[PDB]
Symmetry: C2
Subunit: 179 residues, 2 copies
């Protein structure tokens, strides 16, 4: 898994044509007052909206309240095969747990239509505190569970967060420490 | 920051001889009975040992007990400029906190001699639970603090962990998501 500020991770998206619209989209969604930003912040709670980005890439814009205490056995632990997740928090704070799929127990085997494997919870997993402007990238080996709150951002149990989950085909996204 | 199982992250170390050399060391240290593995596991507690790997790359092999409760304001929060950290846990479990340098308050400005910026603690930062075989990679934008314990691995307060922090010159490391088009 990768995580960090979108504004520090721009170099990840340069010099590739397929990624160009995507990077533009991530920046637009974060820009206060932009069309994409206004659209995302106008989402009714517990709804989503899909935006096509070309080359098999699309964004799932969503808003919801946090559900699970970080110190609990709750949460929906999942991983994917076709797609890499680019999770961008637009407003609010979200807790994410992440663990390697080889450390997790499969509950529901891969469902191709939903591009989804479901795991038993791993409560003690790494915990990412994703505030607005932070990007978390989850690959095939990253089991992840979202919608956690911690004591410092408990208000988002009743005040919705806003985010985009960009799905990009893994065939396009090949993480390397070299170009 | 990047984190994951070393055995799931092999694809990262492709297409340069220098990354290949780095990867070879990381794998050797995890292999029970290897020269590097024995060297790391024989360290006395609270000591470290430096191993040059070529190309300006070197490993700081270390052993120590965990010091700070995760729910505390303790911890030495730092970032670097010249080097990228490859932190590999060889035995035990370690908690690491990581936060973007833009959310941290500078305490000690950059010291070029030691390649170090020191920050005020960010106790609520993301928390990485690094068990044996896990790798955390910290780049210049990643402020990080080590030696945390959580309740699920509190035994390493009294029993030492073993790890390597491999320092790679920034010029060797270019994080990319796709081929350049
Ligand atoms: Zn996902
Ligand atoms: Zn460091």
């Amino acid at each position: 898994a990768i995580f960090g500020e979108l504004s520090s991770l721009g170099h990840l998206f340069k010099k590739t044509q397929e990624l160009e619209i995507l990077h533009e989209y991530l920046k637009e969604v974060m820009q206060k007052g932009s069309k994409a930003n206004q659209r995302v912040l106008n989402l009714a709670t517990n709804t989503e909206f899909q935006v096509p980005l070309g080359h098999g890439i699309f964004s799932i814009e969503q808003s919801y309240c946090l559900e699970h205490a970080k110190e609990s056995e709750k949460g929906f632990f999942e991983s994917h095969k076709k797609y890499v997740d680019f999770q961008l928090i637009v407003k609010g704070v979200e807790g994410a747990k992440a663990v390697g799929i080889n450390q997790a127990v499969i509950k529901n085997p891969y469902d191709e239509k939903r591009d989804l494997i479901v795991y038993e919870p791993v409560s003690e997993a790494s915990f990412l505190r994703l505030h607005a402007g932070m990007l978390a990238i989850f690959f095939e080996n990253d089991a992840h569970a979202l919608r956690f709150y911690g004591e410092s951002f408990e208000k988002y149990r009743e005040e919705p967060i806003f985010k985009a989950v960009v799905k990009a085909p893994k065939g396009l996204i090949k993480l390397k420490l070299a170009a």
